[PDB]
Amino acid sequence: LMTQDELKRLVGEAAARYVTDNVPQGAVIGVGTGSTANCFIDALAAVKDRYRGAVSSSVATTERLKSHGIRVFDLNEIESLQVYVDGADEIDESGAMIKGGGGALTREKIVASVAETFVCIADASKRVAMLGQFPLPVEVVPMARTAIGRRLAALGGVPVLRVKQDGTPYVTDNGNEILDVKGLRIDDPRALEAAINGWPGVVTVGLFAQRGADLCLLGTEHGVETLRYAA
């Protein structure tokens, strides 16, 4: 019996081993966001002296990295990254992911765009036949909130403006709102990502499909599976 937390530790450790097996000494590591990514951070901390530091995908991740004395570089200082290690809210058989549930959509997608290899770390619950039962985050310019909402509704999506504990709109780092869209059945993630990216007022869509996972270390009740997807 392994709890979800134990499966997350297991994939975090497995990703640290993937990095030490595949990424040479002195490298800068691209680092994701979320509870699973935090397990990877803690595991990577035990070999931190082998690497020059990290690029971070969120304030929360930067904070955790610094709590281990890991140097954090601004992505603008970095020309390339071999690896980016991050979770997913969902991942399908093509390696397309929904991400952004905890809000860091935009910076995750930026760091992922620079990295040669996206290593998804996930417990078994994240692997789904078809994306969309986890609500799709769409980061939007505030003046476009209802325009984008209408476009999502025309697809049968149920758009929910993300709110704080106090019921005022969650606002991201770039002064933007998030619409979490429910009820979509995303049988073609690449095509839907392209469509949503064509909408003025969309900042980032939490479909990582045109650039999805290159591999996934999936923590199951029978151990870690390594899933690989087409370059």
- Which residues of this chain interact with its own copies, rule CB under 8 A? 74-76, 79, 106-107, 109-110, 112-114, 141-147, 150, 173-176, 194, 197-201, 203-204, 210-211
Per-residue b or e along 174-212, where b marks 16 or more CB atoms closer than 10 Å to that residue's CB:
eebbbbbbeebebeebeebbeebeeeebbbbbbbbbebb
Report in angstroms how near the CB of residue 186 gets to its own copies at its nearest. 17
* 53 annotated to a ligand binding site: no
Q: Is 108 a catalytic residue?
A: yes
Min CB(74)–its own copies separation in Å = 7
Tell me the residue number closest to K ion, measured at CB.
102
Site string for K ion, 64-103 (x = CB under 5 A): --------------------------------------x-
User: Minimum Å distance from CB 105 to K ion?
Assistant: 6
Q: Which does 176 bind (CB under 5 to 8 A by kind): its own copies, K ion, none?
A: its own copies
Q: According to the annotation, is 149 in a ligand binding site? A: no
Examine residue 183 and tell whether it contacts K ion (CB under 5 A): no
33 is in an annotated binding site: yes
Q: What is the 3-state secondary structure (H, E, C) of the chain?
A: CCCHHHHHHHHHHHHHHHHHHHCCCCCEEEECCCHHHHHHHHHHHCCHHHCCEEEECCHHHHHHHHHCCCCEECHHHCCCEEEEEECCCEECCCCCEECCCCCCHHHHHHHHHHEEEEEEEEEHHHECCCECCCCEEEEECHHHHHHHHHHHHHCCCEEEECECCCCCECCCCCCCEEEEEECCCECCHHHHHHHHHCCCCEEEECEECCCCCCEEEEEECCEEEEEECCC
| Closest to its own copies by CB, 10 or 148 | 148
109 is in an annotated binding site: no
Of 31, 70, 104, 186, the one binding K ion (CB under 5 A) is 104
104 binds, among K ion, its own copies, none (CB under 5 to 8 A by kind): K ion
Residues contributing to the annotated binding site for substrate: 33-36, 86-89, 99-102, 126
Residues in touch with K ion (CB under 5 A): 33, 102, 104
Q: Which residues are catalytic?
A: 108
Residues contributing to the annotated binding site: 33-36, 86-89, 99-102, 126
